[model samples]
Target: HHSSGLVPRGSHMGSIIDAAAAAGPVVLMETAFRKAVESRQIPGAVIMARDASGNLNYTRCFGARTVRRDENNQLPPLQVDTPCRLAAATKLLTTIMVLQCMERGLVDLDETVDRLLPDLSAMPVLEGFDDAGNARLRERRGKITLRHLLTHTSGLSYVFLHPLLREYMAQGYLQSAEKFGIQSRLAPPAVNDPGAEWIYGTNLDWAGKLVERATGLDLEQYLQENICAPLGITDMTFKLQQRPDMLARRADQTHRNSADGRLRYDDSVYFRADGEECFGGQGVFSSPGSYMKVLHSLLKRDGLLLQPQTVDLMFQPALEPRLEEQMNQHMDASPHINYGGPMPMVLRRSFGLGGIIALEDLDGENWRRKGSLTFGGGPNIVWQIDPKAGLCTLAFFQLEPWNDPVCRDLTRTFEHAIYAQYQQG
Candidate 1:
């Protein structure tokens, strides 16, 4: 059952799949995952897979929330409803809220978000590179609109990712640079002219602030009223504190320490606490069941969510072709730096208002089709909505040093299996 207490009216094509076939994609892939778990590659995984109609076809979970075994000497099953960090996957929800506000006439995507928040009216300094590869910085005199933040072209640079920002941040001044927040990120110099370049950073967090100010409602409340309540999704929230019993089910975050080469429980700062307000970019706590509702609504285009045209805007590439080319080569270090594993993402992945848009069919290798909307971030967790095929797949795990080999391999196998099953049948 889905979060709304009703099963999705899926096309049921997956039901005819020969799941028992030993050489079949589904069984082989599941076997691969089972092997990964037996080898201690990862503690557990919660896969909420959908068929061609955005229907929940199967939810295959494996391993344990920890290495500890139960009294029966069995590892705990990774529950489908286990709450794991979705990380940047939260962007799609943020994008949806902004679009909803736009629908309500409470926001204008073309207008500057700074229009309401005067303090944000001015842009930050744009960082550049000199001929000798030296760092350069200049005052950016452009306006930041909702479009810039949604598309990640708002001249912002995450301190964790940008080299120049790391340099500027290292300069001795006040307290430790480690003690930083959204303000610290926002106060930094810009990385490019607004919309002139695509640099991923804290623009969405600012967009959350914009939403709070525009509606006089907290981000949590706004999303609940506009989305969660409407869809009967009860598990998504910014405040885990609000649901102690549910929070207890949160998967123990695990990682492999390089020294020991063994999986160990790990926990550090997650998103901001509820009292501190939700960060628009990455503060949601949800389950596969609840989040599936969000995806299903978009796929059906039944006006159960946003209008069909608005949904169309999300799948279309928001960046121009030149900018898309720039984005392709912009971050050679991205896969290793952000993902911690070798990046298998395409050479020329495009951007949309929602997430990364695969521009071409990844034939002969990764099975992603052209025009799929994908979300990936800090947890190595990822989900994709393929409009062309009408499928959405999410691979969820709580792990550190984002992009563990197991997570990537399993996700690829699951996706390949989906396409293989569809094509063969």
Candidate 2:
């Protein structure tokens, strides 16, 4: 069921798809997901994996919204609906909005972002580090483009992910400053040269601003009118605070305690349905169900929010040979996933218009095929679209200090089970 405007779950436009095929992989993926909770890797997770044709094959829910304790030391029932922050996954939506601008001639994919937002004309140059390990900004570098921002080649840093930003914080930068949400990160100084490397932070924040500037509409309004309205995504929004009902569904924040190295429920920082500006970098709260609809449209290449050609264009590799090599090298060389911890090797890496493109199939445990699109966010969410197999998978788990080993293991089990089932006769 797909529609040009507000395509509900069973709307006329969405009727062509079949959700009847709850295949073997569906059960296997569910089993793998539950193991994470059973083994206490996470309190809960909500995952959805559907085929291109709208076969909603798998949606597994494990754990609860929160596990509270009563005065008598009794454990209350766990809550569900568990709202999750898309984190950097919000970039995909930003990419769609920007591409929509491209299709409407409001914004050009190749034009420099400074063309629309003259404010980005001069970006900060991260010269080096000070003697005390503080980041030193030398000058501003003009020539950053919308393309660079979308592809993570722009020099903006996530403050948490960027090495220099980490140093800046260690030297006592206020990452929790009000500007930290949008102002500083969105228009902050660049940490490196545009197109120099892939740093994966705040590029889409600028992309969101570009959409606002080019269309003369705020991000939330633009999303509702242009993208969400057309695609029938009612539950997703950058301003989760606007929707307390959604926040009520939020699950407890799963934390990997550095002291004991245990995965447990911690409400110290719950699902933030609260933020002033739509920090397109990491500011969208959506449920697994709503997000999967958007993924389904991409997997099918359906013209829900974008034309088929534009969707195809978005999926194509957008990097040159040398730059692509550099990105690959960087992925291979980088271990920490934005200050979380060690990450699995990133090989066969490439960039598409929206996310990472797998250039080759994995030989062993990991089985994502070449050309598969994949990426995740700080909440430990992971997703992949394999056009070759008409498969779209989303694993949404809420946690902090991203790239925690427990969540990673849960994702690994999900992938292995799905691939093993799909690859077999």
Candidate 3:
């Protein structure tokens, strides 16, 4: 039922085991990460790195899953199989599912999605507000294609991310705060014409809806049958009620207090209600090891989930010149928008189908190479697929407030250590 590449290799070839014997040593990572955990800089993390050929496999865990102790009067240590909210990281899986639909001839990348997603299709562009405090909206001229949604050029905006959208919602132009369903959340007006510029928001949520409309299956079921079942991924799910075992292993979410710089247990629930529509953008929980399988499949291009050509398309730049410039400017001014991933403001970047693509080689040693696709969730969980380096790496840290300086430094340390310690021979 599954391809051979989906299974992990038997022996570890990377430097995690023997520092002196291997070409690259994992001591740098171990020392830096251990220091962070011991100093209480981060609550916990699960880091994994796997090459395309399945030879170099490295996995490590540190710290406790929660700031508080369990009933056993002990902190449960973070593990490779601990379930975490993938957050925006779920977008990659949805992207793969949409590409699979394309492979099966169920949808076209460039086709207008109006027929299936009428609500998103007919959204008017919000120009501005009149002096009378009324929103001035106009009919959108450009048709929104799947490409636009996938690349974040659909003109949609997140209320929390864009001030205008937040203001629009506050002005009672859309659904009230009390109603927090998927449709209501996505009912905000477009900030600009589709394809005019790149604005990341609820585009993938709509794209997930497109998949459901086309395939007649909800995101969870579709993923289970198409991607998870075939790949032998058991610990990934949208609803925790169905998987109490996964719930038992769930890592408690933590937030870094800005005033005092202390970690606190954040009980806020960001997931959708059970029986609600699964948000493709920010809905899904999976173990770090299970999520690695999805990334490893794409890195290997094993033809289990998507065709080689489609996977290639995912890595290629998907933005126009003007849109790319706009994206770069946005990232430059507000690096926090990418959730403090390895995107240095100096590195050139462009949008791929599901993640950010590095257009040029990063300066300095052990940095990402050209064509490395990367993205992260709001919870400081980041992952990267470097086709040139023949490796895929993920660092899962359940820290909050998006761009915590401490979390950012830890991610950079992990990424640098990954390239230095796991260089392909």
Best by TM-score: 3
- Selected candidate, larger lDDT, 1 vs 2: 1
Show the colliding residue pairs in model 2: 1-13, 1-14, 1-15, 2-13, 2-14, 65-79, 83-250, 241-273
Candidate 2: residue 251 lDDT (0-100): 52
Residue range with the least summed lDDT across 10 consecutive positions in model 2? 335-344
lDDT digits (tens) for residues 277-301 of candidate 1: 6777877888777887787778778
Model 1, residue pairs in steric clash = none
Lowest summed lDDT across 10 adjacent residues in model 3 is found at: 176-185
What shift in Å separates residue 403 of candidate 3 from its native position after superposition?
2.2
Can you write out model 3's per-residue Cα lDDT over 235-351, one digit (the tens) per residue? Answer: 888786678787777888899988999999987555334436688888888888899999999889999999899999999999879988998888888765654376676567899
The true-structure Cα RMSD of candidate 1 reads 8.0
Ranking by TM-score: 3, 1, 2
**Candidate 2: TM-score?**
0.84
lDDT for model 2, please: 0.70
Query: What lDDT, from 0 to 1, does candidate 3 have?
Result: 0.83
Residue range 243-270, candidate 2, lDDT tens digits: 8786655555567789987766665422
Lowest-scoring 10 consecutive residues by lDDT in candidate 1? 173-182
- Please report the TM-score between candidate 1 and the true structure: 0.84
Clash number by candidate, in order: 0, 8, 0
lDDT of 1: 0.72
